[PDB]
């Protein structure tokens, strides 16, 4: 086979999912041209764990997973193994043994509205921290007190998701950032994603 891996439509997609409902794309049976990535200067963050970006073109894998979402600037440092915070604990957690890359760039020119973009959400309350690569999209009313909530929002009964501000005038730490997390797995199966010859 000779088809290029669709890294274009993962990075260059119009709309990204909220970090609490992060989107995962499965990449298989294609030639992976990693050169476009580390050579494009569009990215503010490009950190690879478990493998070298240079040594990536000449390496095969069984599957490559492309997880994409949106957070704010000061939360970008939580998309890394061994981090804590609202995003790392309640939204998107990488394992301590993560073998992949994290790519992020400022999307304030796309994900901000003059009145505040209230489409991007993150999980604010959860009874326990997420396991690595876990996804929680429930909207159950969070019981913060002894009195049960019966699914009705109110005193000590929180809606678990919070909306990002995302105004063009926000400081950099609160501006939106689009994130792509490439994780490479090497299972005991035929390797379908390799690099060029």
């Amino acid at each position, epitope marked *: 086979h000779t088809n290029l891996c669709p890294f274009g439509e993962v990075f260059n997609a119009t709309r990204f999912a909220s970090v609490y409902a992060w989107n995962r794309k499965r990449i298989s049976n294609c030639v992976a041209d990693y050169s476009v990535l580390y050579n494009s200067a569009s990215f503010s963050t490009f950190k690879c764990y478990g493998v070298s970006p240079t040594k990536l073109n000449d390496l095969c894998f069984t599957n490559v997973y492309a997880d994409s979402f949106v957070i704010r600037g000061d939360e970008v440092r939580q998309i890394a193994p061994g981090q804590t915070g609202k995003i790392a604990d309640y939204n998107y957690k990488l394992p301590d043994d993560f073998t992949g890359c994290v790519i992020a760039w400022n999307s304030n020119n796309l994900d901000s509205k003059v*009145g505040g973009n209230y489409n991007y959400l993150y999980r604010l309350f959860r009874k326990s921290n997420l396991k690595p690569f876990e996804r929680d999209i429930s909207t159950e009313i969070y019981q913060a007190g002894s009195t049960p*909530c019966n699914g*009705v*929002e*109110g*005193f000590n*009964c929180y809606f678990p998701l919070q909306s990002y501000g995302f105004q063009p005038t926000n400081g950099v730490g609160y501006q939106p950032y689009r994130v792509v997390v490439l994780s490479f797995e090497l299972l005991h199966a035929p390797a379908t994603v390799c690099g060029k010859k």
Partner: antibody
Amino acid sequence: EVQLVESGGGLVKPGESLRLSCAASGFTFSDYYMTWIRQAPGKGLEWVSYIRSSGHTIYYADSVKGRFTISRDNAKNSLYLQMNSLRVEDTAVYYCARGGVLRFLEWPLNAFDIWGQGTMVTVSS
Amino acid sequence: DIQLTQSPSSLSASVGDRVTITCRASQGISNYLAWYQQKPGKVPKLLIYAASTLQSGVPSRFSGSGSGTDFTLTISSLQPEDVATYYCQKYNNALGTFGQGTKVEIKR
């Protein structure tokens, strides 16, 4: 001037549909949760519906579940109550009332201090 | 759902008398209770919120007290223009339920 102006009341036949409007002025409408409250002739006040600051939670009284729909347009500074499958007992004066400002770890004690003028809905043949 | 029970149903008093209306919540609602005055065919007017906080413009002869399940609205000195029906409303959560209302008459 901080106020809520209602509109859309009128005469409807049973089973039809009618849509009420509540226009907000003089305050950040998107910061408050809104409610609809009705009062049948000669009866007491009845809480009808509730919509969150940006509409991610919604609640209805059992008498209107499945037939009434609450919505808001924060850009238009407006609150709506879509009433389908109207019944004779739905005849009432309908009010919108602004609740409070949802803040971090606090259910607001300042609420329900501003209501609309009311609008009359009559369901009859 | 928490139910509110208002007492009395109806009462007639005289100008200057102290009037006491009771609102009883089936379960605790902390201090998330409000008191309304509604003259016949008029928009309900908020008198007390947070169980005991007087709304701006309301005469100081109105006062509210209570927390949890027992709440009392008090008109220290009843006045001719207080003739109305009074409702309590809970707002501990999204269900802003009302009481049945207390009609206040005046004996002259």
